[PDB]
Design a protein around this nucleic acid. Sequence first.
RNA 1: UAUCAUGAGGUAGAGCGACUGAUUGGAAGUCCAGAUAAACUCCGAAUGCAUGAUAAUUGACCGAUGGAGUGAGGGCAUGGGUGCUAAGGUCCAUGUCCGAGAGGAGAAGAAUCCGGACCACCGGCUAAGGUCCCGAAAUAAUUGCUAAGUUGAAACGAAGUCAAGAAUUUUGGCAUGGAUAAUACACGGGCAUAAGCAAUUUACCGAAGCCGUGGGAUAUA
RNA 2: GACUGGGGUGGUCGCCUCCAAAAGCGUAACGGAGGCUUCUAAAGGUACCCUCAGGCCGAACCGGUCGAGUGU
RNA 3: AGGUGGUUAUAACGUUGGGGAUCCACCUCUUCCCAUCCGAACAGAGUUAAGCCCAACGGUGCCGAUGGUACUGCGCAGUGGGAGAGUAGGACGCCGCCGA
Lengths: 107, 128, 56, 141, 47, 77
Amino acid sequence: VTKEQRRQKIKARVRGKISGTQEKPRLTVFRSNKQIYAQLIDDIAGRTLASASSLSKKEIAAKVGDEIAKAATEAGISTVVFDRNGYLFHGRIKELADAARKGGLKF
Amino acid sequence: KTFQLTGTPRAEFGKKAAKAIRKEDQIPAVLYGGKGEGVNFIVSQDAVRNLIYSPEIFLVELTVEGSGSYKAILKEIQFHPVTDRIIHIDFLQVTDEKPVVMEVPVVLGHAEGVKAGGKLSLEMRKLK
Amino acid sequence: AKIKIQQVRSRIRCPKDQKRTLDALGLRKLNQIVEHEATPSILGMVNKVRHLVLIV
Amino acid sequence: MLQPKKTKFRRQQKGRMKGFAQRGNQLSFGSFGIKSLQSKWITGRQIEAARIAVTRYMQRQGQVWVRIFPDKPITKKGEGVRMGKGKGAPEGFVAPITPGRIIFEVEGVPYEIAKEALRLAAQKLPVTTKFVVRHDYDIQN
Amino acid sequence: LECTEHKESGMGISRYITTKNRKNTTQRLELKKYNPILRRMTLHKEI
Amino acid sequence: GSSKNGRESESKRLGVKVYGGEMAKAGNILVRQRGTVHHPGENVGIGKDHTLYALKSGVVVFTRKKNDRSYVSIKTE
RNA sequence: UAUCAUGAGGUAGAGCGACUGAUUGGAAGUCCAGAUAAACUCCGAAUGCAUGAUAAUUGACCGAUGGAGUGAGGGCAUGGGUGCUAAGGUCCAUGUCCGAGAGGAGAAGAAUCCGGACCACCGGCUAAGGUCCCGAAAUAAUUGCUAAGUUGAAACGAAGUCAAGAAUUUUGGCAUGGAUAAUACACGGGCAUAAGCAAUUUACCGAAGCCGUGGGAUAUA
RNA sequence: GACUGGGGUGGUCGCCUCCAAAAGCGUAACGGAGGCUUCUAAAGGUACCCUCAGGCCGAACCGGUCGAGUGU
RNA sequence: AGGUGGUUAUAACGUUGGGGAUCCACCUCUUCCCAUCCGAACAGAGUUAAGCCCAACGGUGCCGAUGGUACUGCGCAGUGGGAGAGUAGGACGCCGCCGA
Ligand SMILES: [K+]
Ligand SMILES: [K+]
Ligand SMILES: [K+]
Ligand SMILES: [K+]
Ligand SMILES: [Mg+2]
Ligand SMILES: [Mg+2]
Ligand SMILES: [Mg+2]
Ligand SMILES: [Mg+2]
Ligand SMILES: [Mg+2]
Ligand SMILES: [Mg+2]
Ligand SMILES: [Mg+2]
Ligand SMILES: [Mg+2]
Ligand SMILES: [Mg+2]
Ligand SMILES: [Mg+2]
Ligand SMILES: [Mg+2]
Ligand SMILES: [Mg+2]
Ligand SMILES: [Mg+2]
Ligand SMILES: [Mg+2]
Ligand SMILES: [Mg+2]
Ligand code: NA
Ligand code: NA
Ligand code: NA
């Protein structure tokens, strides 16, 4: 068992429930050993509507979440849905989600 | 180690056509292999003295009246379950590239051997 | 176009689906002739009752 | 007896032999053989009698193969037993065969008396047979 | 071994019918279920 | 002698009730099955006994995917 | 009912180093090669079924109400179980006929072949099957085979005879031996060397079927 | 009491699963095989996290390649 | 050289060779967030060997004709349907979105 198949299993389980549409789009978050990414996706035509990235680091993650919220408000997205994307909802994931909540992104 | 066979083109297909061809004391045959397309033709039972024969007799130089001439080997023969007559023949066209696979009789330590048309790739025959 | 179908054999001992096909064609008597457009549906009925009819 | 040591079910429905054999109709492993021209059930007693007949001849050279195995159980009712009330007493095993199926085959033997040994075997069977030879065999051994 | 017992302490009355294995649970069950009179309340066994 | 057999149970009338291409209404039963022989898709629910039913009206669609898994969905509007 | 379009199958067949259970050699594993199954499946039809749209066709499909009878079935064909791959046996399924159905051929037969009778006729055409006499219509024409009066049941033997081949040998056509009990026996009979068998062509006979003529009745328009 | 290849003797009588069943549903036999007359305070609900069973190697244990369980 | 999808593996597995200002990954440390006997995983604050990506190989797996044959509808071998296996061969993916 490697981290790739572990995270693929978790991703499949989460995508079992979560899905995004033209309203209420999916909010994927990528975390690496350094930097972080966030992406807002419509899972019908496979079109991403907004994104943010990094380009401690809890502040960096919160700034990334606030930037994603700013992009969502610029593009006109009120409600979203957020998927764990293979990561336990704790640490940087929790901080980014809290920052996106403190911004717009009514979810 | 070189046979000569003649054939005539086949047009109709299906079980009715095959029954008519076999009632005229003939065998449907197909030649395929290499690149490009293949051909479907008619062989005669009397014209065949190849499969009912002790040695390999490969390199069946074929002349079909609907096309040119070729060289091939016995690839598949279909027999009747009861009368044990031939009902269908399939030929593998042989080219100088990608040497063919053959089965060659053994002696005692000697074989028939093959180098022209088929460079290599023998398997066995009557290993006992 | 128009084709003529004539019943030449009896419907006795024929299955009910064939009897109903004869009715749908409009043949109720022996040596009866009906005239129909040669549509694929009509041709299918004629195919179903081919052993009882003649194209005249 | 020639029969399996175990079977999942002790009983079997009498099937229906339908057409010609599409497998086991060509001669592998050997040179001469006999094919059946009819559809029938073949008992182990008949098989053993035929093999004993074919092996009393031919001395002990060559090799003999039987290519059918009896694995279908059959029953019989009995004397004074009326119809109904389930299946009867077991009565052995049979092999169902169709036309074109090779029963017996021989190898390593001259043709002229292989033709006689196989006929001796075929006279102890309830089916009409046909002698077959390999389609590569030559007269000079 | 299995038996039917009732939940009580309503508010008319509120009862819930339910089975329990006595040898597995010698004690008395206590679950907060509901009261159609007002709202949620604890309900205990022994009828 | 006697037979130790002779028992059976009543048949459960399983199978596909609404085939692909038909029109279904909300609550219509589509498939009776033992286990997910077919799986639910869009606007199709599954019950306690793995019964497939339509959440919305529309047209029944049968589709196959990897592992040759069959899915049943309702196409509306 | 037919055509088209869409959909789900796991039967026939097939295959089983694609599983489970059997099986064969093999060279307790393993490798290679046979092969098997109602309660095996990596596969997988033809038909059947469902929905929709057209066409043809009746007309009787559906609701509600008045009146019932039936709830001992049977034969044949197909798919099966059972039995002994027995029974004019028995139990299911799909059709059909007798039941409740007359007429024609098969000598004479409930359901095999042809064919569904409103009544009359001293009219005509056909179906199955026939055209030497009993008995309606060809002792018609042409081409072969049979010599057994065969004609109008098997393993297994000579091969009597014709025909087609291959390198003794195969192959089919027609015959022949195997071929068998008790009131007298059979092509229905006479009888026939064709008036037997196989093929083709044309005329003709042939039913209560169809047409014609006269006369009624019952409904839908 | 009834069923019953006459009756008696024996066996059977309600429910569940497979085959008979002929690729929709349904379909008989004193046809071929088996089970039930319960259980769980978690063996229910939910969030999160894991992956059997087997063969070789080395000595219940470390590592590398393809049936187990689901109370009955 | 990342992420995120639609296409039932013609898309998977394997073998061999090539990769680094930064993209990913390995990589040091457990004080607090959290966590298992074990910071191995989960949780945070010198590298291209390996994961990963690129390419070549028809090897292991997948796909797979034409013809023939089996089977089959029509209450007849006349009129229709038509496999499975196998043999040729095909194949080391294709269509998007965001990012730098
Ligand atoms: K007679
Ligand atoms: K006369
Ligand atoms: K029991
Ligand atoms: K084909
Ligand atoms: Mg059942
Ligand atoms: Mg079968
Ligand atoms: Mg059916
Ligand atoms: Mg009664
Ligand atoms: Mg009755
Ligand atoms: Mg009877
Ligand atoms: Mg019978
Ligand atoms: Mg009566
Ligand atoms: Mg009647
Ligand atoms: Mg009569
Ligand atoms: Mg006349
Ligand atoms: Mg008359
Ligand atoms: Mg009349
Ligand atoms: Mg009684
Ligand atoms: Mg069914
Ligand atoms: Na029953
Ligand atoms: Na195929
Ligand atoms: Na194949």
